[PDB]
Amino acid sequence: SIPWIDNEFAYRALAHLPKFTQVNNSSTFKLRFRCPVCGDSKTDQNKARGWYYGDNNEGNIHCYNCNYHAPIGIYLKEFEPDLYREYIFEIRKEKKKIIKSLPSCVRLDKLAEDHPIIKYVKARCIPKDKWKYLWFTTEWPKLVNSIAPGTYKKEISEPRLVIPIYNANGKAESFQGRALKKDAPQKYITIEAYPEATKIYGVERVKDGDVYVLEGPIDSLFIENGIAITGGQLDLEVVPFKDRRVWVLDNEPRHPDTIKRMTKLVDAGERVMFWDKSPWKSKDVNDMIRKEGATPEQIMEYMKNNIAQGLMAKMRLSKYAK
Template sequence: MDITTYKYALQVSQQYELTKTRSHNPLRINFRCPICGDSKVNMYETRGWFYEYKGELRYGCFNCNKNYPFPFYLKLRHPEIYRHYILEKNGDRYKKKEPTVEADTSNIGKKSLTSIIDDSTINKYCVRLDRLPEGHPALLYMQNRLIPEERMCLFWFTMKWRELANAVKPNTCSNNDPEPRIVIPIFDEKGNIASMQGRALRSTEKLRYMTVKSSEDANKVYGLERINPNETVFYLEGPIDSVFIDNALAIVGGTMSLEEAPHKKTRVWVLDNEPRSKDTCARMLKLIEAGERIVIWDKCKWQKKDVNDMILKEGATKEEINQYLRDNIVKGLRAKIRFNEWKKVIL
């Protein structure tokens, strides 16, 4: 199955009720059937599926027994998404003109995300982590960080990071010497790769994290293609932390104004647990004063600064941290009181 079909299946499935990805390789996504509505008696019944069969993706329901190839299903149920899917899958020979993307001013300000990185560029230089052989150093690195197995498909590996970076944005690196990195693709809401971040695997590299954007206004919010905007959306400080959290995003490659950050009505900010950091405390105070919803770590039993370290070094579980986040969303005066009790610096 090609990466374009994979991306669109993830994107479309997030619109359905009770969606759960059961497997990434082969891809199997389960949800309530949008055609028949599944059971009228049991609201938790999920018998609709996107599933991979002989290398091709299909839609099937065990209740109404509808069964279609994914492209036909997309055309039937989501004609507008199907149009973009066909354009991307088949390339320029099908394009009459460049589609325009209208910016949602409530989500991303007034910028339109028009620049993308071709899938062929990523495929030329990278291998997805879940497709690497057991024992591969890159796979072992992520396994040692306790990254959930079902999330390995979100990360790639390259031995040619500098060459890849220069292919996306010329003159990013001074040479094309081999350099191994974990590659974190950053998609826009339509599933196009807009930016990417490389995590160094060698301790000798000067930049541990390096972000390359296809253009200056390219999307730098990680996770947009997977979240449900109608539920609480957690903003974390790094992509790796975000994969442990349900319905989470992360901003990479610098800061972003509140006007630009998507999902204003449902977003919650989760900054690192750094009560002695003036920078973190100042940013948290700014969010509180702007009326934003945030999570404060004052009542948690963990001391490490980020989610991955809490799990890796303190034995926290993903479920415990997700529950803490849901239970400790505050804003306004309550946030200010708890913030003042938590911070250890004078601002």
């Protein structure tokens, strides 16, 4: 199939659909739109559950509301025949911004001990020395609009934990907001300054030895040589230290997405970490420390012993899957 002509043609077809957004990362092409078949959600007028994925072999449209799933060619044949004509004809035709300052953000180590966010991060049991890698704000939409304007229409004051991300050079290129309130648009709001920014927290703090890669930036604070991808593309390539990285995810043996990521990592021949002999039962290392009384150096003891690679990693995954 021809992917780029599908991306070009799909865009115009889905451009007519309302709530049209171009979810284009550095390596994928997706289009978000309201589904034209069902009108998406009747109750929520602002939901766009129709999606187009063009990064595969064939660009396919999938609706998460009415379970419509089709190729772009069938979509064009059924709904846009004038666009469908040229689409099938054209087949024969071819065949950086750096965060220099953080306004209204105060670092946690220079804050007073009676601050309510200090009580929360003490309840999260972060060690004190990591407190100079964390900021706090009350004007998070104002801060984001100071960095990337236009994403927040109204700058209502929201207290959020600032999580600046530095490169190997140590320059801040993105920042993540942890939601202090239980009610929020998102638990982790990642904001980039330029679209090719690194999404791996704390790359500047990597020393010699094995590099442990986790899922949470707060989870990496207990870990020596602990960095954390903030979702995004989850690209192993964009992740450095490929010869010596350690792939640590959250402890969830019955969760299908976690074992899907484990299978993707172990089929790539990577060094994946396994919780199959863990004395603790919590989902993440921070939850293990907070709820099961675990101290960090026991955890530094367990993982190093159970580091796995290749075939003996696969058999472990086989027993950790269920």
